[PDB]
Design a protein around this nucleic acid. Structure first.
Lengths: 212, 82, 108, 162, 67, 175
RNA sequence: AUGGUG
RNA sequence: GUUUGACCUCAAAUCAGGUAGGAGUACCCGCUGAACUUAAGCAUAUCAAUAAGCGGAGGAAAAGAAACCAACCGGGAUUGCCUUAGUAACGGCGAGUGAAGCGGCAAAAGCUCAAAUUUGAAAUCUGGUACCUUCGGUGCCCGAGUUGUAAUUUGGAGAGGG
C-alpha cells in the first residue's frame, strides 16, 4: 500500500461568509482525503476526531465576521497552531483562471528558511500532513495537476497554487497570507507553547484607536 | 512561550516517517532560495510573485527530474477532463 | 426626491404650542419627570455624565419610596438598569431626596 | 391499521354491571344545578335579610382540576371517557394514575359522564373524599375496578391493537 | 434549576409517547454496534456533538433503565 | 393542570401515538373542503397559548394549503370570511402534497367580545385584514422585524429605511 | 420595457 | 329495550341580529417586478431591491417595552432630527456603492397573555322578555361555557399564611 495516510476534518465556526464559504469550497475540494462536517467550545474537536476517526484537524474561527483563526493540529496529541488570515485570495477570482482536475496531490514549493526556526519546522510538518494529499487519496487521479507553495513575507507567509501548463503555470491558489499566532500543547490543549508578538489582533488595534 | 524545548520534542512527536522512505508521499522540496532576498519593497506584490513564480517553476522542474525518475509524471492528462 | 424643511420656522412654533397646552391642563406639574444622572460608556465618553432613563428599583427603595408610587409622584423608573457605581448611585439617591423635599402633593 | 399500546387501552371499558354500579353511586353526587344555587342563596338571602354549614359534597370534574387532584395526590376514583374530540387530551391519564397508584376507571361515553355533572360532556369526572354513607361502597367499588379492570388487563399495556 | 414536577413529567411522557424511529435505530445499533456508529449517525441526523450527547447518552440511560 | 403534560408530549411529533393520530386525522381532513371550519381546536395547547379563548365570538377554520405557506393559509380564509378579523394561526398536520394549517379568528361585530378589555382592541378599524399587510406572528417574521444588528435591514421598513436612507434633505441655513 | 384598446 | 333518550357530526330555513365587497389611494404595510440608460452596447452591478400591476387601512400608518447594544467608571422600548461619514466595509479595489453603537436634541409610558385548584360551590358572558335613569341598568329564561368563562400572577417576579 502506502506509507503516508491522512484524513482531515473540516469545520468552521458560526457567522460564515462568502469569504468563508468560498474558502470552505476550495479547501474542502482540495483535500480528497478529508471529511466535511457541519459547523459548531474548544474541547469537543479531538473527540469528533474519535467519532469520524480522523487523523488531521483544523478549525476556522469567525470573530465579528472578521477574525479568521485557523486552529491546526493532529488529535488528540496535536500540537496546535492557532492562526489568523488576511488578504485572502481564493480560487474564485477572475484573474485566477484555472480549472483543476479533482483530488490530485500537488507538489509543494517552500523556502528553506522555515527550518531556521523550529516552529516553522512544525507548521511545515503539520501542514505537510494536513494539506498534503497522501498518494493516492481515494477519489483522486494519478499523475500531477497543481503546485502549492508556502514561504515567509516578513513572517506573514503566503501559500499559493499554480495550475501547470505542461514548465509553465498560472495560479490556482487559494492565494493565502499566513501567520503563526500561538502554538499550544497538544491538540486543543495546554499552555501557550510558542507566541509571535509580531501579530496584533485587529480587535486590539481598535483598542488602540479608541484611545486616540 | 518562546519554547524550543517542547517545540523540539514536538519535532520528534509530530514528524512523518519522511526519514524512512523516498519522496513519493507529500512531494514538498526545500528550495535553495530564501526569497527574503531580492525583495526590495515588501509592499511590492509582484516582486515575490516573481520570486515564487520561479520558485514553483524551478521546484517543479527538478521535481520533473523526480517524477520522470519516480515514474509517476506531472503533466495533467489532456486526454481526460473530469 | 429632495425634502427641504421650510417649516423649521413653523414646527418650532407648533412645538412651543404643544408644550403650551401640555401645561394648560397639568399646570401645577412640571411637564417632565425626574431623571437619573448616568455615566456614559465607551472609553471616549466615559468621563462625561449624562441624563439616563429612570432611577431604578433599588435607588427608589433606598430613597424611601416605592416604584409604583414613584411613577405617580413624578419620578420615572427604569427596571432594566443596574446600579453599580457607588457615586452615581449616591447622586441619584440624593437627587430624589431633594425631589421629595421640594414637592408638595394635593389631597383628594 | 395497527394502533399503539397507549391507545386501545380505551376500547377496554367497564361492563354493564360495574358501570351501572358506579352510577348507582355518583347519581347521589350530582353537583348541584344552577337553579339550585339560586334556590339556596335566595332562601338564605331572605333569611339573613330578616331572621352550621357542613362541607358540601359533589364529584370534582374539571379536567384541569381533575389532573390537579391527582399528582398531589388527592383523588380516589377517576372516570375517563373513551371518546374525546381531540383524543389527545386524556392519553396520559391511565398511565399517570397508574404510576401514582390511583384508581382510574374507563367508563364509556362523554355524554354519560357529562350527564351526571349537569353538563353536556366531561370525558373526565372523578372524586376523592366522599361522605361516610357510601365510603364502604367506595372501598368496594374501587376494589371492583381494581379487580375487574385493573387485574387481568395489564396485557393492554403492550399489544398494538387493530 | 428544574422543579422535579417537570422532571417527573418529562420522564413519564417519554415512556407514554413511544419512540421515534431515530431513537429506535440508536438503541438498536447500541445494543449491536454501540456508541461509535451511534454518535456517528446521530450527529449526522441531528445537529452537533453537543447534541449527539443528549440523545445517545439518553439512550444508554434508557437501556440500563429498561431493567 | 394538564397543559404541561400536553406540550411536554406535543414536543414529540415523530412518536408512535402522534404518528398514528396524524395518519388518521389527515385522512379525515382531506375528505372535506379547503376551508373547513372546526368548532374545536385539534391541539388545545397551542390554542390556549396563542390566545385562543373558548367562548362565543372566536372562530376556528382549518385550511389545506398546497406545497409563503402559512401566510397563504392566512389569506384564503381572510378572503373567505370578511367580517372576521384574523388573530393567529399554527400548524397541525401535513399531507405529502399539502400542509394543513388551522387559524384563529375573532368576530369584531360580536358584542360579547367588543367588551372584554383584553380582547376588545381588535374591534378598532386599523386591524381590518391584518393578514394582507403581514402584521402577524409569521407575518412579521418574513418582513424580518425584531431587535438586533441581525436585522439592520428593517426595524421599521425596507421601503422605509431605503427611501429615507438615500434621499438628500436640505435645511434652510445650509449644513 | 409596463400595462392596456382593436 | 324492535321502543325511548341523550351526546357527536352535518345539513337546512324568505327566522332574528349583524356584518364584507365598491370610491380614493399624496402618505404608509406587503407581494410581484422590467427596460432606456450608466458602467464598453458587459455575462455582475447599475438604473432599482424603482416605475406600471395586485392586496390592505388610517388621520396617520408602520415600529415598540430587548432572546438590545456593549466591552467601558456601561447605557436600557420605539420613531424622528444634527452627528458619527462619504468612516468601516464593498469595490473588472472599476464606474463607484456604502452603514451602526456611542454624543447632542425633540416626545417620553407603560404593559397584557399561557405556565400552580374556586373547589367551601362558574363566582363569567350573548340573547330574549318586563320595566327603568337607555351609547346602559335590573328581574326573569334559555344558551354558551368545566375540551375552562371570572378572580390572582407576567422573572421588574410571585403565591399561602403569620
Amino acid at each position: 500500500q502506502f506509507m503516508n495516510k491522512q484524513r482531515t476534518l473540516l469545520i468552521s465556526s458560526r457567522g460564515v461568509n462568502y469569504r468563508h464559504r468560498h474558502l470552505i469550497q476550495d479547501l474542502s475540494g482540495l483535500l480528497p482525503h478529508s471529511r466535511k462536517e457541519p459547523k459548531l467550545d474548544l474541547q469537543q474537536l479531538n473527540e469528533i476526531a474519535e467519532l469520524y476517526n480522523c487523523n488531521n484537524v483544523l478549525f476556522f474561527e469567525a470573530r465579528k465576521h472578521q477574525d479568521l483563526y485557523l486552529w491546526l493540529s493532529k488529535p488528540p496529541n496535536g500540537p496546535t497552531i492557532k492562526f489568523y488570515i488576511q488578504n485572502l485570495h481564493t480560487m474564485d477570482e477572475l484573474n485566477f483562471t484555472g480549472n483543476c482536475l479533482k483530488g490530485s496531490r500537488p507538489v509543494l514549493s517552500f523556502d528553506q528558511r522555515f527550518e531556521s526556526s523550529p516552529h516553522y519546522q512544525l507548521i511545515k510538518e503539520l501542514l505537510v500532513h494536513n494539506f498534503g494529499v497522501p498518494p493516492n487519496a481515494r477519489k483522486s487521479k494519478p499523475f500531477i495537476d497543481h503546485v502549492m507553495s508556502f514561504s515567509i513575507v516578513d513572517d506573514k507567509i503566503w501559500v499559493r497554487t499554480y495550475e501547470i501548463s505542461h514548465i509553465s503555470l498560472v495560479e490556482i491558489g487559494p492565494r493565502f497570507v499566513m501567520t503563526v499566532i500561538l502554538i499550544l500543547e497538544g491538540s486543543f490543549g495546554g499552555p501557550k507553547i510558542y507566541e509571535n508578538k509580531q501579530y496584533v489582533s485587529p480587535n486590539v488595534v481598535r483598542a488602540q484607536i479608541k484611545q486616540q | 512561550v518562546n519554547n524550543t524545548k517542547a517545540m523540539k520534542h514536538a519535532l520528534e512527536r509530530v514528524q512523518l516517517p519522511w526519514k524512512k522512505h523516498s519522496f513519493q508521499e507529500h512531494q514538498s522540496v526545500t528550495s535553495e532560495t530564501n526569497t527574503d532576498e531580492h525583495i526590495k519593497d515588501i509592499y511590492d506584490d509582484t516582486e515575490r510573485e516573481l520570486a515564487f513564480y520561479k520558485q514553483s517553476l524551478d521546484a517543479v522542474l527538478v521535481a520533473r527530474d523526480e517524477l520522470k525518475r519516480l515514474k509517476v509524471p506531472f503533466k495533467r492528462p489532456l486526454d481526460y477532463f473530469a | 426626491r429632495v425634502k427641504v424643511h421650510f417649516d423649521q420656522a413653523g414646527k418650532k412654533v407648533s412645538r412651543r404650542n404643544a408644550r403650551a397646552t401640555r401645561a394648560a391642563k397639568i399646570a401645577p406639574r412640571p411637564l417632565d419627570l425626574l431623571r437619573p444622572v448616568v455615566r456614559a460608556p465607551t472609553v471616549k465618553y466615559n468621563r462625561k455624565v449624562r441624563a439616563g432613563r429612570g432611577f431604578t428599583l433599588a435607588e427608589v427603595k433606598a430613597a424611601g419610596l416605592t416604584a409604583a408610587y414613584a411613577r405617580t409622584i413624578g419620578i420615572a423608573v427604569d427596571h432594566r438598569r443596574q446600579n453599580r457605581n457607588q457615586e452615581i448611585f449616591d447622586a441619584n439617591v440624593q437627587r430624589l431626596k431633594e425631589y421629595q423635599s421640594k414637592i408638595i402633593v394635593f389631597p383628594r | 391499521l395497527k394502533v399503539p399500546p397507549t391507545i386501545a387501552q380505551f376500547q377496554y371499558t367497564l361492563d354493564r354491571n360495574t358501570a351501572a354500579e358506579t352510577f348507582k353511586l355518583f347519581n347521589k353526587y350530582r353537583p348541584e344545578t344552577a337553579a339550585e344555587k339560586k334556590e339556596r342563596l335566595t332562601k338564605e338571602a331572605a333569611a339573613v335579610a330578616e331572621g352550621a354549614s357542613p362541607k358540601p359534597y359533589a364529584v370534582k370534574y374539571g379536567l384541569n382540576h381533575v389532573v390537579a387532584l391527582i399528582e398531589n395526590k388527592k383523588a380516589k376514583l377517576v372516570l375517563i371517557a373513551n371518546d374525546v374530540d381531540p383524543i389527545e387530551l386524556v392519553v396520559f391519564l391511565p398511565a399517570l394514575c397508574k404510576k401514582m397508584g390511583v384508581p382510574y376507571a374507563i367508563v364509556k361515553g362523554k355524554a354519560r359522564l357529562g350527564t351526571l355533572v349537569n353538563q353536556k360532556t366531561s370525558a373526565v369526572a372523578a372524586l376523592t373524599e366522599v361522605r361516610a354513607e357510601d365510603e364502604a361502597a367506595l372501598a368496594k367499588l374501587v376494589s371492583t375496578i381494581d379487580a375487574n379492570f385493573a387485574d387481568k388487563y395489564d396485557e393492554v399495556k403492550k399489544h398494538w391493537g387493530g | 434549576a428544574a422543579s422535579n414536577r417537570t422532571k417527573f413529567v418529562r420522564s413519564l411522557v417519554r415512556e407514554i409517547a413511544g419512540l421515534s424511529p431515530y431513537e429506535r435505530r440508536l438503541i438498536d445499533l447500541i445494543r449491536n454496534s454501540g456508541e461509535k456508529r451511534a454518535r456517528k449517525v446521530a450527529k449526522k441526523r441531528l445537529g452537533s456533538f453537543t447534541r449527539a450527547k443528549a440523545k445517545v447518552e439518553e439512550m444508554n440511560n434508557i437501556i440500563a433503565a429498561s431493567r | 393542570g394538564a397543559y404541561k403534560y400536553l406540550e411536554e408530549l406535543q414536543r414529540k411529533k415523530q412518536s408512535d401515538v402522534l404518528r398514528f393520530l396524524q395518519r388518521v386525522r389527515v385522512w379525515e381532513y382531506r375528505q372535506k373542503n379547503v376551508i373547513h371550519r372546526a368548532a374545536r381546536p385539534t391541539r388545545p395547547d397551542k390554542a390556549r397559548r396563542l390566545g385562543y379563548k373558548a367562548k362565543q365570538g372566536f372562530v376556528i377554520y382549518r385550511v389545506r394549503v398546497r406545497r409563503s405557506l402559512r401566510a397563504t393559509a392566512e389569506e384564503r380564509v381572510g378572503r373567505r370570511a370578511a367580517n372576521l378579523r384574523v388573530l393567529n394561526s399554527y400548524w397541525v398536520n401535513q399531507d405529502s402534497t399539502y400542509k394543513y394549517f388551522e387559524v384563529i379568528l375573532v368576530d369584531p361585530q360580536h358584542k360579547a367580545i367588543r367588551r372584554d378589555a383584553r380582547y376588545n382592541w381588535i374591534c378598532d378599524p386599523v386591524h381590518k385584514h391584518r393578514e394582507a399587510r403581514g402584521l402577524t406572528a409569521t407575518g412579521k417574521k418574513s418582513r424580518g422585524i425584531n431587535k438586533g444588528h441581525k436585522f439592520n435591514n428593517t426595524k421599521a421598513g425596507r421601503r422605509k429605511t431605503w427611501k429615507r436612507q438615500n434621499t438628500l434633505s436640505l435645511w434652510r441655513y445650509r449644513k
